[PDB]
Amino acid sequence: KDLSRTAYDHLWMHFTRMSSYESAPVPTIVRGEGTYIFDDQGRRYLDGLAGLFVVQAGHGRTELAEAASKQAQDLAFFPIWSYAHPKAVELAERLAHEAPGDLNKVFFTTGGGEAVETAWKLAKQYFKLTGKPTKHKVISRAVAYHGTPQGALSITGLPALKAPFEPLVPGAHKVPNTNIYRAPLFGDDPEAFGRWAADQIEQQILFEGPETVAAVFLEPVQNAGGCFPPPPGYFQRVREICDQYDVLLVSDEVICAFGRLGTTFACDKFGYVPDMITCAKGMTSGYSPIGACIISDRLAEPFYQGDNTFLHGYTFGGHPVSSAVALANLDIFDREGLNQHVLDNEGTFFATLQKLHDLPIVGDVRGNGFFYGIELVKDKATKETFTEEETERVLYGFLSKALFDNGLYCRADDRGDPVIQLAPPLISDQSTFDEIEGILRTVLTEAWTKLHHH
Amino acid sequence: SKDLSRTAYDHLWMHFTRMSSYESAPVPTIVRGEGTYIFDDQGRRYLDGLAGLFVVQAGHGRTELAEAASKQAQDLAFFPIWSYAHPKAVELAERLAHEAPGDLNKVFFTTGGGEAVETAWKLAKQYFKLTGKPTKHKVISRAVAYHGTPQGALSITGLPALKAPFEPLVPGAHKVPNTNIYRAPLFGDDPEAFGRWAADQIEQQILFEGPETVAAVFLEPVQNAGGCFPPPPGYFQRVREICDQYDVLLVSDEVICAFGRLGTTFACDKFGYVPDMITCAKGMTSGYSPIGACIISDRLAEPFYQGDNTFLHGYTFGGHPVSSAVALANLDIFDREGLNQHVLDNEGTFFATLQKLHDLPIVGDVRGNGFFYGIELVKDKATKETFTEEETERVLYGFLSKALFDNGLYCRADDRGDPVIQLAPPLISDQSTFDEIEGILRTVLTEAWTKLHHH
Numbered sequence: 001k002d003l004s005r006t007a008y009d010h011l012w013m014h015f016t017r018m019s020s021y022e023s024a025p026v027p028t029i030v031r032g033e034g035t036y037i038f039d040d041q042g043r044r045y046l047d048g049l050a051g052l053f054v055v056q057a058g059h060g061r062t063e064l065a066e067a068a069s070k071q072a073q074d075l076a077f078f079p080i081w082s083y084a085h086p087k088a089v090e091l092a093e094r095l096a097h098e099a100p101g102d103l104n105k106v107f108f109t110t111g112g113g114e115a116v117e118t119a120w121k122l123a124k125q126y127f128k129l130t131g132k133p134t135k136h137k138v139i140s141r142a143v144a145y146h147g148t149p150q151g152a153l154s155i156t157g158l159p160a161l162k163a164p165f166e167p168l169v170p171g172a173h174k175v176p177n178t179n180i181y182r183a184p185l186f187g188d189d190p191e192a193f194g195r196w197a198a199d200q201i202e203q204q205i206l207f208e209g210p211e212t213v214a215a216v217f218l219e220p221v222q223n224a225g226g227c228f229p230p231p232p233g234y235f236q237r238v239r240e241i242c243d244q245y246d247v248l249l250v251s252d253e254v255i256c257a258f259g260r261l262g263t264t265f266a267c268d269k270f271g272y273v274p275d276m277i278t279c280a281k282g283m284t285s286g287y288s289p290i291g292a293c294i295i296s297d298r299l300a301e302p303f304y305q306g307d308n309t310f311l312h313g314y315t316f317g318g319h320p321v322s323s324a325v326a327l328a329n330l331d332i333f334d335r336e337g338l339n340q341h342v343l344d345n346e347g348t349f350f351a352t353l354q355k356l357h358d359l360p361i362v363g364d365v366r367g368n369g370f371f372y373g374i375e376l377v378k379d380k381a382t383k384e385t386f387t388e389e390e391t392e393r394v395l396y397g398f399l400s401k402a403l404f405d406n407g408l409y410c411r412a413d414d415r416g417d418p419v420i421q422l423a424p425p426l427i428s429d430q431s432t433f434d435e436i437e438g439i440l441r442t443v444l445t446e447a448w449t450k451l452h453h454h
Numbered sequence: 455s456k457d458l459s460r461t462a463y464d465h466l467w468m469h470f471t472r473m474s475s476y477e478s479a480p481v482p483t484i485v486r487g488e489g490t491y492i493f494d495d496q497g498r499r500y501l502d503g504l505a506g507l508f509v510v511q512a513g514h515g516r517t518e519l520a521e522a523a524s525k526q527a528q529d530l531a532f533f534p535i536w537s538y539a540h541p542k543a544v545e546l547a548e549r550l551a552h553e554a555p556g557d558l559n560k561v562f563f564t565t566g567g568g569e570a571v572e573t574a575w576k577l578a579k580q581y582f583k584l585t586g587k588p589t590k591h592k593v594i595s596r597a598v599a600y601h602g603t604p605q606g607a608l609s610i611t612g613l614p615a616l617k618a619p620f621e622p623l624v625p626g627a628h629k630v631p632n633t634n635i636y637r638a639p640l641f642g643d644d645p646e647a648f649g650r651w652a653a654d655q656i657e658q659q660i661l662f663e664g665p666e667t668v669a670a671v672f673l674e675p676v677q678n679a680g681g682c683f684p685p686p687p688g689y690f691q692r693v694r695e696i697c698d699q700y701d702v703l704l705v706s707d708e709v710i711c712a713f714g715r716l717g718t719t720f721a722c723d724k725f726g727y728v729p730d731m732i733t734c735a736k737g738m739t740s741g742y743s744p745i746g747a748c749i750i751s752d753r754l755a756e757p758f759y760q761g762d763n764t765f766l767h768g769y770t771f772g773g774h775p776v777s778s779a780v781a782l783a784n785l786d787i788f789d790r791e792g793l794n795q796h797v798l799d800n801e802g803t804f805f806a807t808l809q810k811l812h813d814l815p816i817v818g819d820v821r822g823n824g825f826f827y828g829i830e831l832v833k834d835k836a837t838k839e840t841f842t843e844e845e846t847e848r849v850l851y852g853f854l855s856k857a858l859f860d861n862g863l864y865c866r867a868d869d870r871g872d873p874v875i876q877l878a879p880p881l882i883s884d885q886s887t888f889d890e891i892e893g894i895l896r897t898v899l900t901e902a903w904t905k906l907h908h909h
């Protein structure tokens with residue numbers, strides 16, 4: 001088992017340092033039940049990230065497995081290319097019903113990067129069809145991750161993910177994120193900080209020329225950097241800026257949609273209506289690949305006239321089996337009231353994690369719904385962060401291994417500053433939150449002993 | 455007649471000019487200059503309040519520069535500096551290197567400023583390839599700044615109206631705020647804090663794009679477009695520190711500011727910073743023969759001067775013998791007449807003379823440095839309320855532009871940023887020149903205020 005090398009010899013894992021497995025076993029997950037996963041040695045771990053911000057309803061759902069086999073037996077695949085099949089139609093209508101405003105057109109994909117590509121392409125062709133052909137640029141936030149195909153990667157704001165692959169698609173420009181914990185200005189004033197951070201988008205539009213800007217892409221709660229919720233008033237101001245300058249607002253809800261924040265579409269949690277939503281991940285609780293770009297009827301109008309066509313598509317978009325699974329997943333959400341469960345429990349989950357503020361290594365606890373980041377520090381009074389050496393030895397060398405070994409699968413990361421991130425299945429309850437807090441308390445107390453002076 | 459003459463409209467495509475203006479009206483035609491004055495084709499005289507186009511530092515009608523040109527043209531008017539030298543280019547390269555700060559000792563001649571900007575960005579890209587940092591290619595510059603029109607320099611230009619018809623341009627250019635403290639969103643009442651903030655926006659953009667991907671920052675010493683923004687105290691020192699920290703090259707774009715405009719040969723010395731490269735053109739010859747240069751640190755030249763490496767870049771007419779001889783003769787005027795020190799000795803009274811216009815209601819700001827000033831016009835100075843688009847069209851372009859010229863002052867009236875009148879007269883200007891400028895502006899700006907409110 002330990003000397004088995006099948007994965008190292010053939011499976012090129014995603015965003016993974018493969019040399020780690022030349023002489024050591026690859027951690028292999030074989031089974032899930034509810035909020036737990038099991039490895040190939042029969043060890044059990046709490047699935048603190050719902051796989052990869054995906055498994056909303058929990059593992060082991062026979063209802064979803066049976067929905068897949070029932071549809072696969074009848075019609076597993078037919079393309080939605082000048083043809084429809086019933087489950088894609090039903091799901092498009094259902095998503096349209098749930099989406100706000102006139103977001104009534106559903107362009108299905110398999111993944112979230114594919115949906116982000118769809119949104120930027122749609123914006124470009126929309127502006128060509130409506131006589132504004134210079135509109136093509138896109139604005140997004142520093143540190144944000146929007147996916148990996150080269151268009152989406154241009155919108156991604158993590159230079160380490162981009163430098164080996166440049167040049168990418170022209171036209172992407174970055175603005176500050178809303179990390180109030182480290183705000184250079186207005187850190188003590190959320191409303192003023194929100195207005196400032198939104199106005200940075202207006203400034204970038206002005207710097208590049210509004211007639212050349214097509215769209216702004218924003219996650220409702222920013223993932224990379226550690227769960228930055230939107231300041232009060234932020235999205236309202238962004239919506240106003242986008243309206244003023246004729247720029248489209250894309251709510252990138254690949255993590256946030258499907259109940260992560262307690263609503264089907266996360267824009268509704270914050271009271272804004274975007275022009276498009278990108279989504280994927282939790283639409284099926286991950287049980288079968290599918291996602292979508294959901295699009296305002298205003299944007300669809302020119303494409304629905306005469307001999308015009310949105311020249312875009314994916315073989316597997318709107319897949320019958322995935323569509324059937326998605327509908328079965330939304331049926332679970334409705335019958336079990338998962339969205340309201342998250343709204344009803346977000347306050348106690350946050351409060352439970354905030355108990356960790358009595359530990360010296362904990363600098364911040366932040367997030368919304370069932371999505372939280374805990375930022376680690378050398379000194380909470382000055383917010384002194386880890387050195388690079390401390391990040392390598394303590395965050396990755398010690399903490400990441402110790403969390404898993406103590407029974408908690410979650411994310412330890414330093415895309416921004418050192419953070420532990422949590423996004424468990426939406427069936428999690430107080431017992432789950434207590435289990436998480438207890439393992440974090442053990443391991444974070446141990447981690448503090450490995451920091452020098454601190 | 456002259457008035458019905460359409461030769462220019464029919465054949466001369468003027469630069470940045472709305473040509474339909476001349477379908478049915480004559481083109482203003484300048485035929486002669488003397489000192490700080492120019493004369494049109496009817497013999498009317500105007501004060502050359504822009505030195506042509508921020509160029510004619512020594513004044514018009516310099517026989518010494520005319521004779522320098524003919525003397526060189528008779529002996530050798532052209533031979534390329536391509537694997538060959540000719541004496542006047544060598545002598546001028548040595549002279550400019552002597553005047554430039556630090557180890558800025560290598561002179562890559564061009565004919566214009568845009569050509570020099572292109573040189574600087576290309577040199578930065580190849581330098582980082584030769585030194586094993588191949589991902590470094592991006593460039594940072596300021597909103598509203600004008601860095602020229604070839605498509606690489608145009609990417610560095612920060613005026614979207616100049617760029618949108620021509621995109622996509624060269625990838626890699628990113629913008630940061632300019633240092634217009636008059637309209638600063640933050641720190642408007644604190645120059646030092648504003649300077650630190652504005653410099654730190656450069657660090658932020660480097661971090662946003664990834665420092666290993668960023669090659670250079672391009673900054674004018676005093677920003678022209680937007681109306682003569684001088685650097686806040688401490689700004690360039692902080693920029694230099696950021697560039698050092700992130701291994702990014704600093705390019706001082708001195709196409710306007712060099713050759714005495716701010717009282718020094720190289721304008722980076724006015725503000726006490728040493729860039730990695732200087733771009734320059736314009737005043738090198740007082741405009742009497744086209745030439746410019748990118749002047750480059752020996753640190754940057756080092757890899758290119760080793761073995762079989764070549765900076766694969768050039769221009770036929772760069773380092774032109776006649777232009778080089780004229781530049782040397784122009785620098786001789788500067789030395790004998792002490793033009794640099796004259797500007798330093800007169801900049802305070804020029805500024806204070808223009809500041810007399812602050813008692814006019816239409817005047818919101820007077821700003822600049824050396825012999826380079828902007829006067830910003832406003833609807834309400836207490837609130838800094840700017841002109842509406844309609845007010846700009848009627849008062850700035852409809853009335854002011856014409857009235858300035860007709861009252862004897864050639865200068866720039868512009869709204870690339872907000873509505874400003876800019877001044878950059880020849881360096882031989884003195885208090886009499888400044889008084890003349892102030893008097894014509896007072897007349898026309900009093901009239902402009904009345905027109906602003908006659909709607």
Ligand SMILES: Cc1ncc(COP(=O)(O)O)c(CNc2cccc(C(=O)O)c2)c1O
Nearest residue numbers: 111112113114145146147219252254255280
């Ligand atoms: C906001 C956002 N947009 C686009 C994507 C791309 O989705 P696909 O992967 O389906 O193409 C994402 C994906 N988000 C994601 C994926 C993998 C890891 C992590 C992490 O932060 O650890 C985050 C995302 O979070």
Ligand SMILES: Cc1ncc(COP(=O)(O)O)c(CNc2cccc(C(=O)O)c2)c1O
Nearest residue numbers: 566567568569600601602674707709710735
């Ligand atoms: C800072 C700067 N950089 C580059 C150039 C390009 O130089 P060439 O023109 O020689 O290619 C300039 C030129 N600057 C310039 C040229 C023409 C008009 C105006 C105006 O502001 O009215 C300014 C300049 O000011």
Ligand SMILES: [Ca+2]
Nearest residue numbers: 096099101103
């Ligand atoms: Ca809808």
Ligand SMILES: [Ca+2]
Nearest residue numbers: 551554556558
């Ligand atoms: Ca030198």
Ligand SMILES: [Cl-]
Nearest residue numbers: 393394398450
């Ligand atoms: Cl240790």
